[PDB]
Amino acid sequence: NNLKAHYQKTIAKELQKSFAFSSIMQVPRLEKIVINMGVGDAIRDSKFLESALNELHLISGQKPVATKAKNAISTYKLRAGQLIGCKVTLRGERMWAFLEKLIYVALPRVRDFRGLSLKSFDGRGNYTIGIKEQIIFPEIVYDDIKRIRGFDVTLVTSTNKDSEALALLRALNLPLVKG
RNA sequence: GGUUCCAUGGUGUAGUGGAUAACAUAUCUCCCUGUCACGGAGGGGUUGCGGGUUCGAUUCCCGUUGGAACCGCCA
Ligand SMILES: [Mg+2]
């Protein structure tokens, strides 16, 4: 990606100067964006889960692996050995492609993207974005599951400090309130 | 003293071999009638206590209460 090379040059220079980092790779580096569109309807409407996967596939270019619960609950109708939820973890070129596509196409189409930040870092440098609806994503046709759901896009970084993660986010211009 | 059975709606009783609780009376609302009873329509209301097993107990297991049914002899 041309923006990937732009990321290289720009992130290196500003970050290096911003904290006098003694090495170019001391600057934070983003690793992997997990997407987890999971639903318990597979306990009853198994069909739905299948469609779920395809949409997830259609969004990232990686086929989603379906995850299984590690316990069993009667109230939730849960039982061990069943597949409830798919997770995809993008890396390399595809992860940066999805990140740019999200921030530039999907996110500003959000009904009311006022944003949320500073109050999202887990204290170790991660970040989770809770999407409310799937239809807003461009890689989705109107025909879909009878139920509509959101997403749990998350982020990782090489650093362990949440403040430096915020600094990388600002350098990348991820558009949130004051952050 | 010991042994078998039972505890389900307000009252009388069925079910459940773990995933679910009905019948009648009674109760409420509305037709009905001068009025009321009877009648007609509709509505509503449930596992003795505890503690384990199971993802899940009214049901399966062991204890604790209450009510019954049987026995407690030979000198
Ligand atoms: Mg005698």
Side-chain angles (χ1 to χ4, degrees):
Chain A
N1 189 331
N2 62 87
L3 186 170
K4 255 291 296 165
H6 213 188
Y7 149 70
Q8 177 267 332
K9 323 129 178 180
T10 53
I11 266 47
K13 159 152 85 58
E14 323 144 41
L15 277 290
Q16 187 64 318
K17 303 188 185 310
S18 294
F19 331 106
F21 270 128
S22 48
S23 173
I24 321 91
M25 29 70 84
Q26 301 238 40
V27 317
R29 331 162 40 211
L30 174 127
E31 226 74 11
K32 55 139 281 201
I33 320 88
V34 185
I35 302 96
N36 178 22
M37 186 282 262
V39 49
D41 315 334
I43 310 277
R44 55 153 55 170
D45 169 332
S46 291
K47 195 52 144 33
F48 272 4
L49 171 293
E50 280 221 301
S51 170
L53 316 168
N54 323 127
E55 316 144 61
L56 191 34
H57 187 11
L58 281 150
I59 211 76
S60 36
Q62 303 215 172
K63 149 222 302 182
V65 41
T67 325
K68 308 160 34 84
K70 295 144 300 145
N71 285 269
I73 309 131
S74 45
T75 57
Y76 299 68
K77 316 174 40 200
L78 166 71
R79 191 86 59 97
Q82 309 174 282
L83 70 102
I84 42 152
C86 41
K87 52 136 271 164
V88 196
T89 166
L90 325 178
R91 314 192 170 252
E93 148 189 274
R94 333 145 75 91
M95 76 145 195
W96 277 105
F98 175 82
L99 187 49
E100 157 181 25
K101 194 180 172 279
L102 171 72
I103 171 175
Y104 275 39
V105 188
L107 289 174
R109 253 181 35 86
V110 156
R111 177 180 112 249
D112 280 340
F113 186 128
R114 289 176 207 174
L116 194 169
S117 48
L118 299 65
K119 190 195 314 183
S120 65
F121 303 112
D122 69 354
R124 259 71 34 81
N126 315 343
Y127 188 132
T128 59
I129 324 186
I131 280 44
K132 272 264 167 25
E133 294 219 341
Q134 79 287 358
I135 310 117
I136 54 168
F137 275 36
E139 270 153 334
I140 276 187
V141 198
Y142 188 68
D143 250 347
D144 45 52
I145 292 167
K146 289 173 174 171
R147 165 74 290 131
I148 76 102
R149 290 182 283 273
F151 293 101
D152 270 35
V153 156
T154 88
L155 303 317
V156 196
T157 166
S158 66
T159 181
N160 46 20
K161 183 167 252 313
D162 60 312
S163 76
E164 263 155 3
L166 177 60
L168 177 274
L169 259 59
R170 299 302 333 112
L172 203 37
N173 296 344
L174 186 50
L176 297 316
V177 301
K178 40 207 88 203

